[PDB]
């Protein structure tokens, strides 16, 4: 493999993160005060890293940080129950650990942390973060296993209730690549609805990484993936591979939902920068 | 493997296809004028084939042909956007290509086109084909990989909203096999609801082919599969294997939906043609 | 592998089961009169066993026993249609067989019975057991393959409409383990809704067993699984592995559904019996 690939992990990474009410009513995470996004920033680590997140709640309401998939002690699951949210103005230090796979003493095989995970609020609105997740307190987390191929870029599509990334219907987001780019999608669903994520012209493998190890990988290859609240998958595609450049739609294939605007564009450009048609 | 298996692909195939309003209000595809069906005809090819479809719209409205999974350029994705539908009376030539798997130059592994796919309209009713798909403009596409086991017969069950194959509730379809037949099911969902497809007395592997490579295939074996709009999967079973002949129901296991009528019969006969019970 | 593992099967097992109206209006299955439970008792067998269930309906209404996944002749599919339910006061003898995987004469590979399955009523309320299932006529079935790891304990969570195990919202069930226990979960959905089962602090493999065979298993590793009516999966976890003890929430991650009360606790204790927090 002469493509770039992930290194063995085991570093202790530190991070500042803020919850911030946005002028428009929404709430978002950010790494800097006043640079909050919906989705929140992508956090990426290698199997075996440890992440110390110094989380500061700049909001007038309790708020928390709860993560999927990664190892965390109960002090860091970010629930009101476990005395683990953060009161307004407060600052708490969450710790996410990750681990590689390997045999346990009993001879069984321990799964690693690798995957396409995500984080979100667990206290705003309700004791399950329905308000926070609605207002935009979610973001993607990627844990790489030593060897995973690394992309040219990662984009995060989040189906949150009837929106993509908390955007007005029929407003994307759109994305751009050039034919041949290795594009990584992190696809997260939040809210109370079920969806099917469809991408024109492209397909991935329905497994951990969206990529086939080689000729023996039995994983189904799909281009429509059903998805429900707190589901998260990811994949990599070669932009326009086998199909050329174009304005390739992605959308929820639920007919009412795409009709109601859950649609974006994967704009794959010719090397001259043009998109055929469009 | 003394069963029949798919040959290596690489042919160029031509096809005439028609969209047509049916006397009863629906719309269907067909290979011949006046011989249209809902679901539309099955297109089946081998990885590496190329398919040229001379599509002719015999309807008074714009209509298109959009396919999943297969390689196609943006001129053949059948969206209004990409100037790719077909106006009434018009005739466009869509091209779908397919490719085998193999190593890329970066050493990664490119997935092949093989799968259980489908094609449907993308412009009738809405810019997402909500009307076409509701009326019947959908059909199955099978792409086989060299060596795939070939069935004795394929059948197509489509859960389109609260119907099976656009049939009035509580009216099938029913299918027939003799015990021991290798039956292939192609299972497509369309519309705005989510379903679970259940078959009595039979089970398959939740992977690309519904069939386990052999002793090492980790794929889960299931008899109930959740399924959302534009989801498509397929499998093969041995009719009555281990259970003998009978009127074996298949249905959406959603309790309200099977109540409202999404039920059919897999009628597996003894050699004498009789169904125990029934 | 120095953990306990399932033996090769092939025994002929016998069983008495009862359907029982419960004082509070529900219906339950049991192994003894007056000892019925919702969910019903867990039947567990090895690939190759045969199970003869002497089912006795003690209710004023027709009721049946229909099983997923296992081999059964149409005489024992428990549908009104195939004259296979049981009249009030009646006693039928259902038979479920299971088989191991192996090569067929055509050289294809026949799947084994192994899996996380379930049984439920098929005639109470409607011709599809909608009333039976609503009232609690469902229970889990585990078919083990020779070699499967055996757990320290199994627990069954059933999402039946807006309830867990037919319990009043916000009332568990809760379970307890001690850090390090090998806990098996059998997860079944019933009714008319779709769900996502999430579990704090833990993760399993989305395959047949929830466990990775070793370093080549491509199976996604998840902590949130979408689940529809009559869907059934299972897994094992090491209680608090990598995360220590705590009141570990599990719930439907559907924001409205967990809000409405589909929540339980996985109470993982230290040897003290103490739960940090709680
Ligand atoms: Cu939670
Ligand atoms: Cu949707
Ligand atoms: Cu498409
Ligand atoms: Cu969550
Ligand atoms: Cu589309
Ligand atoms: Cu349904
Ligand atoms: Cu069944
Ligand atoms: Cu489509
Ligand atoms: Cu049934
Ligand atoms: Cu739910
Ligand atoms: Cu969680
Ligand atoms: Cu069932
Ligand atoms: O589509
Ligand atoms: O069933
Ligand atoms: O959560």
Coordinates of N, CA, C and O in Angstrom, one line a residue, chain B residues 101-250:
Chain B
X101 N -13.6 -6.2 -9.1 CA -12.7 -5.7 -8.1 C -11.2 -5.9 -8.5 O -10.9 -6.7 -9.4
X102 N -10.4 -5.3 -7.8 CA -8.9 -5.4 -8.0 C -8.1 -4.3 -7.4 O -8.7 -3.3 -6.9
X103 N -6.8 -4.5 -7.3 CA -6.0 -3.5 -6.6 C -5.9 -2.2 -7.5 O -5.8 -2.3 -8.7
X104 N -5.9 -1.1 -6.8 CA -5.6 0.2 -7.4 C -4.1 0.3 -7.4 O -3.3 -0.5 -7.0
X105 N -3.6 1.4 -8.0 CA -2.2 1.7 -8.0 C -1.7 2.0 -6.6 O -0.6 1.5 -6.3
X106 N -2.5 2.7 -5.8 CA -2.0 2.9 -4.4 C -2.0 1.6 -3.6 O -1.7 1.7 -2.4
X107 N -2.4 0.4 -4.2 CA -2.4 -0.8 -3.4 C -3.6 -1.1 -2.6 O -3.8 -2.2 -2.2
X108 N -4.5 -0.1 -2.5 CA -5.8 -0.4 -2.0 C -6.6 -1.2 -2.9 O -6.2 -1.4 -4.1
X109 N -7.8 -1.6 -2.5 CA -8.6 -2.6 -3.1 C -9.9 -2.0 -3.6 O -10.7 -1.5 -2.8
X110 N -10.1 -2.0 -4.9 CA -11.3 -1.4 -5.4 C -12.5 -2.4 -5.4 O -12.3 -3.5 -5.9
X111 N -13.6 -2.0 -4.9 CA -14.8 -2.9 -4.8 C -15.4 -3.1 -6.2 O -15.3 -2.2 -7.0
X112 N -15.9 -4.3 -6.5 CA -16.6 -4.5 -7.8 C -18.0 -4.1 -7.7 O -18.6 -3.8 -6.7
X113 N -18.6 -4.0 -8.9 CA -20.0 -3.6 -9.1 C -21.0 -4.7 -8.5 O -22.2 -4.4 -8.4
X114 N -20.5 -5.9 -8.2 CA -21.5 -7.0 -7.9 C -22.4 -6.6 -6.8 O -22.0 -6.0 -5.8
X115 N -23.7 -6.9 -6.9 CA -24.6 -6.7 -5.9 C -26.1 -6.9 -6.3 O -26.3 -7.2 -7.5
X116 N -27.0 -6.6 -5.4 CA -28.4 -6.6 -5.6 C -28.8 -5.1 -5.7 O -29.0 -4.5 -4.6
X117 N -29.0 -4.6 -6.9 CA -29.3 -3.2 -7.1 C -30.7 -3.0 -7.6 O -31.5 -3.9 -7.6
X118 N -30.9 -1.8 -8.0 CA -32.3 -1.5 -8.6 C -32.2 -0.2 -9.4 O -31.2 0.6 -9.3
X119 N -33.2 0.1 -10.2 CA -33.4 1.2 -11.0 C -34.8 1.8 -10.8 O -35.7 1.0 -10.5
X120 N -34.9 3.1 -10.9 CA -36.2 3.7 -10.7 C -36.3 5.1 -11.4 O -35.2 5.6 -11.8
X121 N -37.5 5.6 -11.4 CA -37.6 7.0 -12.0 C -37.2 8.1 -11.0 O -37.3 7.9 -9.8
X122 N -36.7 9.2 -11.6 CA -36.2 10.2 -10.7 C -36.8 11.6 -11.0 O -36.3 12.6 -10.5
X123 N -37.9 11.7 -11.8 CA -38.4 13.0 -12.2 C -39.9 13.1 -12.1 O -40.5 14.2 -11.9
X124 N -40.6 12.0 -12.3 CA -42.1 12.0 -12.2 C -42.6 12.3 -10.8 O -42.2 11.7 -9.8
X125 N -43.5 13.3 -10.7 CA -44.0 13.7 -9.5 C -43.2 14.8 -8.8 O -43.6 15.9 -8.6
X126 N -42.0 14.4 -8.5 CA -41.1 15.4 -7.9 C -39.7 15.2 -8.5 O -39.5 14.2 -9.2
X127 N -38.8 16.1 -8.3 CA -37.4 16.0 -8.8 C -36.7 14.9 -8.1 O -35.5 14.8 -8.3
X128 N -37.4 14.1 -7.3 CA -36.8 12.8 -6.8 C -37.6 11.6 -7.2 O -37.3 10.5 -6.6
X129 N -38.5 11.7 -8.1 CA -39.2 10.6 -8.6 C -40.3 10.0 -7.6 O -40.7 8.9 -7.7
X130 N -40.7 10.9 -6.7 CA -41.7 10.4 -5.7 C -43.0 9.9 -6.4 O -43.6 8.9 -5.9
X131 N -43.4 10.5 -7.5 CA -44.6 10.1 -8.2 C -44.3 8.8 -9.0 O -45.1 7.9 -9.0
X132 N -43.3 8.9 -9.8 CA -42.9 7.7 -10.6 C -42.8 6.4 -9.8 O -43.3 5.4 -10.1
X133 N -42.0 6.5 -8.7 CA -41.8 5.4 -7.8 C -43.1 5.0 -7.1 O -43.3 3.8 -7.0
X134 N -43.9 5.9 -6.8 CA -45.2 5.5 -6.2 C -46.1 4.8 -7.3 O -46.8 3.8 -7.0
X135 N -46.0 5.2 -8.5 CA -46.8 4.6 -9.6 C -46.3 3.2 -10.1 O -47.0 2.5 -10.7
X136 N -45.0 3.0 -9.9 CA -44.5 1.7 -10.3 C -43.2 1.7 -11.1 O -42.7 0.6 -11.5
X137 N -42.6 2.9 -11.3 CA -41.4 3.0 -12.1 C -40.2 2.6 -11.2 O -39.4 3.4 -10.8
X138 N -40.1 1.3 -10.8 CA -38.9 0.7 -10.2 C -38.8 -0.7 -10.7 O -39.8 -1.4 -11.0
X139 N -37.6 -1.2 -10.6 CA -37.2 -2.6 -11.0 C -35.9 -3.0 -10.6 O -35.0 -2.2 -10.2
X140 N -35.6 -4.3 -10.5 CA -34.4 -4.8 -9.9 C -33.3 -5.0 -11.0 O -33.5 -5.2 -12.2
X141 N -32.0 -4.8 -10.5 CA -30.8 -5.0 -11.2 C -29.9 -5.9 -10.5 O -29.6 -5.6 -9.3
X142 N -29.5 -7.0 -11.1 CA -28.5 -7.9 -10.5 C -27.2 -7.9 -11.2 O -27.2 -8.0 -12.5
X143 N -26.1 -7.7 -10.5 CA -24.8 -7.7 -11.1 C -24.0 -8.9 -10.4 O -23.8 -8.8 -9.2
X144 N -23.7 -9.9 -11.2 CA -23.1 -11.1 -10.6 C -21.6 -11.0 -10.8 O -21.0 -10.4 -11.7
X145 N -20.9 -11.6 -9.8 CA -19.4 -11.7 -9.8 C -19.0 -13.1 -10.3 O -19.7 -14.1 -10.0
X146 N -17.9 -13.2 -11.0 CA -17.5 -14.5 -11.5 C -17.5 -15.5 -10.4 O -16.8 -15.4 -9.4
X147 N -18.3 -16.6 -10.6 CA -18.4 -17.6 -9.7 C -19.6 -17.6 -8.8 O -19.9 -18.6 -8.2
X148 N -20.3 -16.5 -8.7 CA -21.5 -16.4 -7.9 C -22.4 -17.6 -8.3 O -22.5 -18.0 -9.5
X149 N -23.0 -18.3 -7.3 CA -24.0 -19.4 -7.6 C -25.2 -18.8 -8.3 O -25.8 -17.8 -7.8
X150 N -25.7 -19.5 -9.3 CA -26.8 -19.1 -10.1 C -28.1 -19.9 -9.6 O -28.0 -21.1 -9.4
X151 N -29.2 -19.2 -9.5 CA -30.4 -19.8 -8.9 C -31.2 -20.6 -10.0 O -30.9 -20.6 -11.2
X152 N -32.3 -21.3 -9.5 CA -33.2 -21.9 -10.5 C -34.2 -20.8 -10.9 O -34.8 -21.0 -12.0
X153 N -34.4 -19.8 -10.2 CA -35.4 -18.7 -10.5 C -35.1 -17.6 -9.5 O -34.7 -17.8 -8.4
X154 N -35.4 -16.4 -10.1 CA -35.3 -15.1 -9.3 C -36.7 -14.6 -9.2 O -37.5 -14.7 -10.1
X155 N -37.1 -14.1 -8.0 CA -38.3 -13.4 -7.7 C -38.0 -12.1 -7.1 O -37.0 -12.0 -6.3
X156 N -38.9 -11.0 -7.3 CA -38.6 -9.7 -6.8 C -39.8 -9.3 -5.9 O -40.9 -9.1 -6.4
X157 N -39.5 -9.1 -4.6 CA -40.5 -8.5 -3.7 C -40.0 -7.0 -3.5 O -38.9 -6.8 -3.0
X158 N -40.9 -6.1 -3.8 CA -40.7 -4.7 -3.5 C -41.8 -4.2 -2.5 O -43.0 -4.2 -2.8
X159 N -41.3 -3.7 -1.4 CA -42.2 -3.0 -0.4 C -42.2 -1.5 -0.8 O -41.2 -0.8 -0.5
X160 N -43.2 -1.1 -1.5 CA -43.3 0.2 -2.0 C -44.4 0.8 -1.2 O -45.6 0.5 -1.3
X161 N -44.0 1.7 -0.2 CA -44.9 2.3 0.8 C -45.6 1.1 1.5 O -44.9 0.3 2.0
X162 N -46.9 1.1 1.6 CA -47.6 0.0 2.3 C -48.1 -1.1 1.4 O -49.2 -1.7 1.7
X163 N -47.4 -1.4 0.3 CA -47.8 -2.4 -0.6 C -46.6 -3.3 -1.0 O -45.4 -2.9 -0.8
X164 N -46.9 -4.5 -1.5 CA -45.9 -5.3 -2.1 C -46.1 -5.3 -3.6 O -47.2 -5.7 -4.0
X165 N -45.1 -4.8 -4.3 CA -45.2 -4.7 -5.7 C -46.4 -4.0 -6.2 O -47.0 -4.3 -7.3
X166 N -46.9 -3.0 -5.5 CA -48.0 -2.1 -5.9 C -49.3 -2.9 -6.0 O -50.1 -2.6 -6.8
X167 N -49.4 -3.9 -5.1 CA -50.6 -4.8 -5.2 C -51.6 -4.3 -4.1 O -51.2 -3.8 -3.0
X168 N -52.9 -4.5 -4.3 CA -53.9 -4.2 -3.3 C -53.6 -5.1 -2.0 O -53.1 -6.2 -2.2
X169 N -53.7 -4.5 -0.8 CA -53.4 -5.3 0.4 C -54.0 -6.7 0.4 O -55.1 -6.9 -0.2
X170 N -53.4 -7.6 1.0 CA -53.9 -9.0 1.2 C -54.1 -9.7 -0.1 O -55.0 -10.5 -0.3
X171 N -53.2 -9.5 -1.1 CA -53.3 -10.1 -2.4 C -52.0 -10.6 -2.9 O -51.8 -10.7 -4.1
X172 N -51.0 -11.0 -2.0 CA -49.8 -11.4 -2.4 C -48.8 -10.3 -2.8 O -48.8 -9.2 -2.1
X173 N -47.9 -10.5 -3.7 CA -47.7 -11.7 -4.6 C -47.5 -13.0 -3.8 O -47.0 -13.0 -2.7
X174 N -47.9 -14.1 -4.4 CA -47.5 -15.5 -4.0 C -46.5 -16.0 -5.0 O -46.5 -15.6 -6.1
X175 N -45.6 -16.9 -4.5 CA -44.6 -17.5 -5.4 C -44.7 -19.0 -5.1 O -45.2 -19.5 -4.1
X176 N -44.2 -19.8 -6.1 CA -44.2 -21.2 -6.0 C -42.8 -21.8 -6.3 O -42.1 -21.3 -7.2
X177 N -42.5 -22.8 -5.5 CA -41.3 -23.6 -5.8 C -41.6 -25.0 -5.4 O -42.5 -25.3 -4.7
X178 N -40.8 -25.9 -5.9 CA -40.8 -27.3 -5.4 C -39.7 -27.4 -4.4 O -38.7 -26.7 -4.4
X179 N -39.9 -28.3 -3.4 CA -38.9 -28.5 -2.4 C -37.5 -28.7 -3.1 O -37.5 -29.4 -4.2
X180 N -36.5 -28.1 -2.6 CA -35.2 -28.3 -3.2 C -34.7 -27.3 -4.2 O -33.5 -27.2 -4.5
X181 N -35.7 -26.5 -4.8 CA -35.3 -25.5 -5.8 C -34.4 -24.5 -5.2 O -34.6 -24.1 -4.0
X182 N -33.5 -24.0 -5.9 CA -32.6 -22.8 -5.5 C -33.3 -21.6 -6.0 O -33.2 -21.2 -7.1
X183 N -34.0 -20.9 -5.0 CA -34.8 -19.7 -5.3 C -34.0 -18.5 -4.9 O -33.4 -18.4 -3.8
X184 N -34.0 -17.5 -5.7 CA -33.4 -16.2 -5.5 C -34.4 -15.1 -5.2 O -35.3 -14.9 -6.1
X185 N -34.3 -14.4 -4.1 CA -35.2 -13.3 -3.8 C -34.4 -12.0 -4.0 O -33.3 -11.9 -3.5
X186 N -35.0 -11.0 -4.7 CA -34.5 -9.6 -4.7 C -35.5 -8.8 -4.0 O -36.7 -8.8 -4.3
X187 N -35.0 -8.0 -3.0 CA -35.8 -7.4 -2.0 C -35.5 -5.9 -2.0 O -34.4 -5.5 -1.6
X188 N -36.4 -5.1 -2.5 CA -36.3 -3.6 -2.6 C -37.4 -2.9 -1.8 O -38.5 -3.4 -1.9
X189 N -37.0 -1.9 -1.2 CA -38.0 -1.0 -0.5 C -38.0 0.4 -1.1 O -37.0 0.9 -1.5
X190 N -39.2 1.0 -1.2 CA -39.4 2.3 -1.8 C -40.4 3.0 -1.0 O -41.3 2.5 -0.4
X191 N -40.3 4.4 -1.1 CA -41.4 5.2 -0.5 C -40.9 6.0 0.7 O -39.8 6.6 0.7
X192 N -41.8 6.0 1.8 CA -41.5 6.8 2.9 C -41.6 6.0 4.2 O -41.4 6.6 5.3
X193 N -41.8 4.7 4.2 CA -41.8 3.9 5.4 C -40.6 3.0 5.5 O -39.9 2.7 4.6
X194 N -40.4 2.5 6.7 CA -39.4 1.5 7.1 C -40.2 0.2 7.3 O -41.3 0.2 7.7
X195 N -39.5 -0.9 7.0 CA -40.1 -2.2 7.0 C -39.1 -3.2 7.6 O -37.9 -3.0 7.8
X196 N -39.7 -4.4 8.0 CA -38.8 -5.6 8.3 C -39.4 -6.7 7.4 O -40.6 -7.0 7.4
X197 N -38.5 -7.3 6.6 CA -38.9 -8.4 5.7 C -38.6 -9.7 6.5 O -37.5 -9.9 7.0
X198 N -39.7 -10.5 6.6 CA -39.6 -11.8 7.3 C -40.1 -12.9 6.4 O -41.1 -12.7 5.7
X199 N -39.4 -14.0 6.4 CA -39.8 -15.2 5.7 C -39.9 -16.4 6.7 O -38.9 -16.7 7.4
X200 N -41.0 -17.1 6.7 CA -41.2 -18.3 7.5 C -40.3 -19.4 7.0 O -40.1 -19.6 5.8
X201 N -39.8 -20.2 8.0 CA -39.1 -21.5 7.6 C -37.8 -21.3 6.8 O -37.2 -22.4 6.5
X202 N -37.4 -20.1 6.5 CA -36.2 -20.0 5.7 C -35.3 -18.9 6.3 O -35.7 -18.1 7.2
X203 N -34.0 -18.9 6.0 CA -33.1 -17.9 6.5 C -32.0 -17.7 5.5 O -31.7 -18.6 4.6
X204 N -31.3 -16.6 5.6 CA -30.2 -16.3 4.7 C -29.1 -15.5 5.4 O -29.3 -15.1 6.6
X205 N -28.0 -15.3 4.7 CA -26.8 -14.6 5.3 C -26.9 -13.1 5.0 O -27.1 -12.7 3.8
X206 N -26.9 -12.2 6.0 CA -26.9 -10.8 5.8 C -25.6 -10.3 5.2 O -24.9 -9.5 5.9
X207 N -25.3 -10.7 4.0 CA -24.1 -10.2 3.3 C -24.5 -9.9 1.9 O -25.7 -9.7 1.5
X208 N -23.5 -9.7 1.0 CA -23.8 -9.2 -0.3 C -24.7 -10.2 -1.1 O -25.7 -9.8 -1.8
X209 N -24.5 -11.5 -1.0 CA -25.1 -12.5 -1.8 C -26.2 -13.3 -1.0 O -26.9 -14.1 -1.6
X210 N -26.4 -13.1 0.3 CA -27.3 -13.9 1.1 C -26.7 -15.3 1.4 O -27.5 -16.1 2.0
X211 N -25.5 -15.6 1.0 CA -25.0 -16.9 1.0 C -23.6 -16.9 1.6 O -22.8 -16.0 1.3
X212 N -23.3 -17.8 2.5 CA -22.0 -17.9 3.2 C -20.9 -18.5 2.3 O -21.1 -19.5 1.7
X213 N -19.8 -17.8 2.2 CA -18.6 -18.3 1.4 C -18.3 -19.7 1.8 O -18.0 -20.6 1.0
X214 N -18.3 -20.0 3.2 CA -18.0 -21.3 3.8 C -17.8 -21.1 5.2 O -18.3 -20.1 5.9
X215 N -17.0 -22.0 5.8 CA -16.9 -22.0 7.3 C -16.3 -20.7 7.9 O -16.4 -20.5 9.1
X216 N -15.7 -19.8 7.2 CA -15.1 -18.6 7.8 C -15.9 -17.4 7.7 O -15.6 -16.4 8.3
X217 N -17.0 -17.4 6.9 CA -17.8 -16.2 6.7 C -18.5 -15.7 8.0 O -19.4 -16.4 8.6
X218 N -18.1 -14.5 8.6 CA -18.7 -14.1 9.8 C -20.1 -13.5 9.7 O -20.6 -13.1 10.7
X219 N -20.6 -13.6 8.5 CA -21.9 -12.8 8.3 C -22.9 -13.4 9.1 O -23.0 -14.7 9.3
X220 N -23.7 -12.6 9.8 CA -24.9 -13.0 10.5 C -25.9 -13.8 9.7 O -26.1 -13.4 8.5
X221 N -26.5 -14.8 10.2 CA -27.6 -15.5 9.5 C -28.9 -15.0 10.1 O -29.0 -15.0 11.4
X222 N -29.8 -14.6 9.3 CA -31.0 -13.9 9.8 C -32.2 -14.4 9.0 O -32.1 -15.2 8.0
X223 N -33.4 -14.0 9.5 CA -34.6 -14.4 8.8 C -35.6 -13.2 8.8 O -36.7 -13.3 8.4
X224 N -35.1 -12.0 9.3 CA -35.8 -10.8 9.4 C -34.8 -9.7 9.2 O -33.7 -9.7 9.8
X225 N -35.1 -8.8 8.3 CA -34.1 -7.8 7.9 C -34.9 -6.4 7.8 O -35.9 -6.3 7.1
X226 N -34.3 -5.5 8.5 CA -34.9 -4.1 8.5 C -34.5 -3.5 7.1 O -33.5 -3.8 6.5
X227 N -35.4 -2.6 6.6 CA -35.2 -2.1 5.2 C -35.9 -0.8 5.0 O -37.1 -0.6 5.3
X228 N -35.2 0.2 4.5 CA -35.7 1.5 4.3 C -35.7 1.9 2.8 O -35.3 1.2 2.0
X229 N -36.4 3.1 2.6 CA -36.5 3.5 1.2 C -35.2 3.4 0.4 O -34.2 3.9 0.8
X230 N -35.3 2.8 -0.8 CA -34.2 2.5 -1.8 C -33.2 1.6 -1.3 O -32.1 1.4 -1.9
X231 N -33.5 0.8 -0.2 CA -32.6 -0.3 0.2 C -32.9 -1.5 -0.7 O -34.0 -1.8 -1.1
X232 N -31.8 -2.2 -1.1 CA -32.0 -3.3 -1.9 C -31.0 -4.4 -1.4 O -29.8 -4.2 -1.2
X233 N -31.5 -5.6 -1.2 CA -30.7 -6.8 -0.9 C -31.3 -8.0 -1.6 O -32.4 -7.9 -2.1
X234 N -30.5 -9.1 -1.5 CA -31.0 -10.3 -2.2 C -30.3 -11.5 -1.5 O -29.4 -11.4 -0.8
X235 N -30.9 -12.6 -1.8 CA -30.4 -13.9 -1.2 C -30.9 -15.1 -2.0 O -31.8 -14.9 -2.8
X236 N -30.3 -16.2 -1.7 CA -30.9 -17.5 -2.3 C -31.2 -18.4 -1.1 O -30.5 -18.4 -0.1
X237 N -32.3 -19.1 -1.2 CA -32.6 -20.2 -0.3 C -32.9 -21.5 -1.1 O -33.1 -21.5 -2.3
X238 N -32.8 -22.6 -0.3 CA -33.2 -23.9 -0.9 C -34.6 -24.1 -0.4 O -34.8 -24.4 0.8
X239 N -35.6 -24.1 -1.3 CA -37.0 -24.1 -0.9 C -37.2 -25.3 0.0 O -36.9 -26.5 -0.3
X240 N -37.7 -25.0 1.2 CA -38.1 -26.1 2.2 C -36.9 -26.9 2.8 O -37.2 -27.8 3.5
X241 N -35.7 -26.5 2.5 CA -34.5 -27.1 3.1 C -34.7 -27.3 4.6 O -34.8 -26.3 5.3
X242 N -34.7 -28.5 5.1 CA -34.8 -28.7 6.5 C -36.2 -28.4 7.1 O -36.4 -28.6 8.3
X243 N -37.2 -28.1 6.3 CA -38.5 -27.8 6.8 C -39.6 -28.4 6.0 O -40.7 -28.5 6.5
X244 N -39.3 -28.9 4.8 CA -40.2 -29.5 3.9 C -41.2 -28.5 3.3 O -41.1 -27.3 3.5
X245 N -42.2 -29.1 2.6 CA -43.1 -28.3 1.8 C -44.1 -27.6 2.7 O -44.4 -28.0 3.8
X246 N -44.7 -26.5 2.2 CA -45.8 -25.8 2.9 C -46.0 -24.5 2.3 O -45.3 -24.0 1.3
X247 N -47.1 -23.8 2.8 CA -47.4 -22.4 2.4 C -46.7 -21.6 3.5 O -47.3 -21.3 4.5
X248 N -45.5 -21.2 3.1 CA -44.7 -20.4 4.0 C -44.9 -18.9 3.8 O -44.7 -18.4 2.7
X249 N -45.4 -18.2 4.9 CA -45.6 -16.8 4.7 C -44.3 -16.0 4.7 O -43.4 -16.3 5.4
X250 N -44.3 -14.9 3.9 CA -43.4 -13.8 4.0 C -44.2 -12.6 4.2 O -45.4 -12.5 3.8

